[PDB]
């Protein structure tokens, strides 16, 4: 219902040649998208500490929280978009993006 | 807090009723396993992912990486995996501290 969250889950493996400073700047820019994208309300990210997925190799997670029933197209065309944008789409060796409403 | 995150793809044979059963049963583990804090799950709506990719996300909150492991080895979790592992084709597990 109203006020339900729409979440994106970004699942990343960075290319070997991406530097630690580059990764940090990427996450910093993503967190700040909240201030730029009206429908975007939260960004939290994390580094996996367990490494139990064998050969899949994903290491980082970004959780993006959006308001529901609001356009997010300004995010889709934003230069910083991890999949579509010119700025960061070269950073990842592997990338998955999911779009779901959390429920219980 | 820390997050135990599950990304899963069900086996092709699994029905909608069985996915509902899977998540109802899993969410109820919070009533049984002391270590668990909140559980949320959701279905991916991305058309790109649906044919062959992962389809469902489960988020579980824990106090620490230690209490994630308390959950992992709890009899009720061992039991859950024993009889519901058959439901998934593959999964990804991540344990991390969210930050901004």
Best interface-test mutation with B: which of A8, A9, A23, A66 has the largest number of B CBs within 10 A?
A9
What is the SS3 string spanning chain A?
CCCCEEEEEEEEEECCCCCHHHHHHHHHHHHHHHHHCCCEEEEEEEECCCCCCCCCCCCEEEEEEEECCCCCHHHHCCCCCCCCCCCCCCCEEEEEEEEECCEC
- Experimental determination technique: X-ray
Cα–Cα–Cα angle for A64, B34, B89, nearest 5°? Answer: 55
Q: Which residues of A touch B (CB under 8 A)?
A: 7, 9, 11, 31, 42-50, 52-53, 56, 58, 61, 63, 96-104
Which of B57, B48, B66 has the alpha carbon at shortest distance from B26? B57
* DSSP-assigned letter for residue B14: -
Number of structural domains found in chain A: 1
Q: Which domain range does residue A4 map to?
A: 1-104
3-state secondary structure of B33: coil
Ramachandran quadrant class, A67 (left: phi over 0; alpha: psi -120 to 50; beta: rest): beta
Are the beta carbons of A102 and A7 closer than 8 angstroms?
yes
Contact A3, A65 (CB under 8 A): no
The catalytic site residues of B sit at 71, 74
3-class state of residue B68 by DSSP: helix
Q: Which helix (H) or strand (E) holds B82?
A: helix B75-84
Q: Known binder of ligand: residue B72?
A: no
Between chains, do B99 and A46 touch, taking CB under 8 Å as contact?
yes
Vertex A12: Cα angle to B45 and A23 (nearest 5): 135
Report d(CA B64, CA B96) in Å as an integer: 9
Pair of tokens at residue A42: 């939260």
CB-CB under 8 Å, A101 with B46: no
Q: Which residues of B54-73 are buried (b: 16+ CB within 10 A; e: fewer)?
A: bbbbbbbbbeeeebbebbee
Nearest neighbour of A99 by CB, restricted to B5, B45, B100: B45
DSSP secondary structure code for residue B50 in this structure: H
- Provide the CATH number for the domain around residue B23: 3.30.70.100
Is there a binding annotation on residue B71? yes
Q: Is B36 annotated as a binding residue?
A: yes
Answer yes or no: are the C-beta atoms of B26 and B76 closer than 8 Å: no
């Amino acid at each position: 219902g109203p006020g339900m969250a729409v979440k994106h889950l970004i699942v990343l493996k960075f290319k070997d040649e991406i530097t630690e400073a580059q990764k940090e700047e990427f996450f910093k820019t993503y967190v700040n998208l909240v201030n730029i994208i009206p429908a975007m309300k939260d960004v939290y990210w994390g580094k996996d500490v367990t490494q139990k997925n064998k050969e899949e190799g994903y290491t980082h997670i970004v959780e993006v929280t959006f308001e529901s029933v609001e356009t997010i197209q300004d995010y889709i065309i934003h230069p910083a978009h991890v999949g579509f944008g010119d700025v960061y789409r070269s950073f990842w060796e592997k990338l998955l993006i999911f779009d779901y409403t959390p429920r219980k």
